[PDB]
Amino acid sequence: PMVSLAQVRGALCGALLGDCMGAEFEGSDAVELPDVLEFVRLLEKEKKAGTLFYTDDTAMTRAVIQSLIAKPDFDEVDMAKRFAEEYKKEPTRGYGAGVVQVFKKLLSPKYSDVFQPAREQFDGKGSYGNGGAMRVASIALAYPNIQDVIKFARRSAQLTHASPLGYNGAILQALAVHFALQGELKRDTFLEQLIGEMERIEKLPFCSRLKKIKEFLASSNVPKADIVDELGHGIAALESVPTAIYSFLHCMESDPDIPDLYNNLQRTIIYSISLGGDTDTIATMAGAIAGAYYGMDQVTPSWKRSCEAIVETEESAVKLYELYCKQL
């Protein structure tokens, strides 16, 4: 049962890789698997280290981590402060057009309720973007109890994403990492775990997305086009978090298009990015799930050395592991 440092480090490094590599194709509407496979080859031969920069996905991931270390019992005010101060420090990391206002509002003295800026988004409807899920992995790595994972995924997500679609997307991504983490579950048990939890929480949309995943996994050679059409590859959590989960699950086996000299974590990241659209966020999420599942053994030296801040990430993984051991 017990989660290893290799799993915590794997998840965080998987998350970093997915963001840094996915970022190179973000928003390019026609992205082809051939471009990704050529990208990876170039990457492996780069002489200089640290050439791939992380984006807001990692900036927000680090703020989550720093809040949990400072306030292990979960302090949404501390976390809110860290999101806003990181934005203020490095505003060009690639934040969504909507979420900038929450950070600007949190930095002002006008709000005492840290959830209120998020409540105000889109004419009071709140954001359904995937920004809550892109950064949420560390909750499942820090809190062994699945209920803490659910409630803290929601509250952390709700700092910016007040639509149920946003925060239920965050809960689902946290759950996927949570269940990926405990053992090496089989595809069917993992999905059964996920379908069961989301039924309770719903996020209805996400539940039926999980059903579509079951169907797809029961087929072979499903074209990208069917996955993009049915699961999505968009900015919305509904159109990215299930897609991240599918990429992970699919790449548990050989994909005929990806050379099988790439390991599962590499395949997952490669496959994820090939879906196009919001490539940095879908890959960071799929990479977190795969990293938690397969661990650091599949985070290869040549891949990880190419990301900005890999060392700080590895360090932060050690501190997350120590805080996971404190909760046991």
Ligand SMILES: CO[C@H]1O[C@H](COP(=O)(O)OP(=O)(O)OC[C@H]2O[C@@H](n3cnc4c(N)ncnc43)[C@H](O)[C@@H]2O)[C@@H](O)[C@H]1O
């Ligand atoms: C560079 O890629 C970055 O954006 C990705 C997402 O990040 P985010 O979710 O943190 O940001 P935001 O909360 O701003 O929602 C993002 C955008 O979704 C749209 N939108 C959402 N709900 C909406 C709603 N109810 N009505 C109308 N429009 C809505 C808006 O166009 C909004 O501007 C991530 O991959 C990140 O790095």
Ligand SMILES: [Mg+2]
């Ligand atoms: Mg990004």
Ligand SMILES: [Mg+2]
């Ligand atoms: Mg993005």
